[PDB]
Design a protein around this ligand. Structure first.
Ligand SMILES: O=C(Nc1cccc2ccccc12)c1cccnc1
Ligand SMILES: [Cl-]
Ligand SMILES: [Cl-]
Ligand SMILES: [Cl-]
Ligand SMILES: [Cl-]
Ligand SMILES: [Zn+2]
Length: 308
């Protein structure tokens, strides 16, 4: 016969390249195991002349690739890279319009939760620990958000099409961020002080109102009053089961609204600027106040000490 070869590069992080000489009579799968080209699964495809010099993603199946993969992604989940490529093959087809100066996402594949989460990140002070999220988030800020969206889906174990919860998505992103400074001190009355650190310092479930949190809130044999003693964080995220709630200009940073039923609904994003903007993927509307089924509100913070 004839024995044709081309040079290609393999990678796990798209920075460190590994020279390979491949045989054009055999599948990528036969030579590398699972192989991807900008998200497309090429496992079962033979190399084409047009592939010469291109970078393919492979699985971290030896020690060089494992160390590179862990240093870049901070995960040893063996399905991670497959899940990332699968998502990226869809997210690179989404549109990321600039809406009121923020990178949003045009509705597709039930992605409203991601669009609100992405708009929220652009309004709060947060730095990611994995280089993969640092690099993708920098590009997402500049308007090329496909990698960042595909990484969020991979790190949160969501496939394209699956509706997620904004609070849970933010929770997972927060676990991969530098929130070590963050500290909350609470008191309860039936006294009992507690101290929360990192992610648990910036999140509360039960009330949307930061004001109401500082004054105190009823909770579980009769009732008890919980209130905010001290807060050290650049923001706080107040969450509750979706319920009609009134948002007013200048009283909050941003918020997520959830309409519809369990596992069949739609998020919109409200931002407080010169007035209230409702951002619904590519869609933009304004009002002086906003009433809706709110589930999350974000507030700016630095340092707070009670006067109780
Ligand atoms: O119920 C939801 N979110 C939640 C909000 C508040 C409290 C919750 C408690 C348990 C489960 C989901 C909750 C939900 C459902 C479908 C899509 N997105 C979100
Ligand atoms: Cl996917
Ligand atoms: Cl949706
Ligand atoms: Cl970052
Ligand atoms: Cl991390
Ligand atoms: Zn009691």
């Amino acid at each position: 016969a004839e024995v044709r070869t081309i040079k290609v590069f393999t990678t796990v992080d798209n920075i460190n390249l590994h020279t390979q000489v491949v045989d054009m009579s055999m599948t990528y799968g036969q030579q590398f195991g699972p192989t991807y080209l900008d998200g497309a699964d090429v496992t079962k495809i033979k190399p084409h002349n047009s592939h010469e010099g291109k970078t393919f993603y492979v699985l971290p199946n030896d020690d060089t690739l494992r160390v590179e993969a862990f240093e870049y992604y901070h995960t040893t989940d063996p399905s991670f890279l497959g899940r990332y490529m699968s998502a990226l093959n869809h997210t690179k087809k989404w549109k990321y319009p600039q809406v009121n100066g923020l990178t949003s996402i045009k509705w597709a594949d039930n992605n409203s939760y991601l669009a609100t989460a992405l708009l929220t990140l652009q309004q709060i002070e947060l730095k990611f620990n994995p280089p993969a999220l640092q690099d993708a988030y920098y590009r997402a800020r500049a308007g090329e958000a496909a990698n960042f969206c595909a990484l969020i889906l991979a790190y949160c174990n969501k496939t394209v099409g699956e509706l997620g919860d904004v609070r849970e998505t933010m929770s997972y992103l927060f676990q991969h961020a530098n929130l070590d400074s963050c500290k909350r001190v609470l008191n309860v009355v039936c006294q009992q002080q507690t101290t929360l650190k990192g992610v648990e310092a910036v999140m509360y479930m039960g009330t949307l109102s930061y004001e109401q949190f500082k004054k105190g809130v009823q909770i579980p044999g009769k009732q008890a009053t919980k209130y905010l003693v001290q807060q050290e964080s650049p923001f706080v995220m107040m969450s509750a089961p979706p319920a009609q709630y009134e948002l007013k200009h200048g009283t909050f940073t941003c918020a997520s609204e959830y309409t519809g039923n369990y596992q069949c609904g739609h998020y919109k994003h409200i931002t407080s600027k010169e007035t209230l903007y409702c951002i619904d993927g590519a869609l933009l509307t304004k009002s002086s106040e906003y009433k809706g089924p709110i589930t999350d509100v974000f507030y700016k913070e630095n340092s707070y000490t009670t006067t109780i």
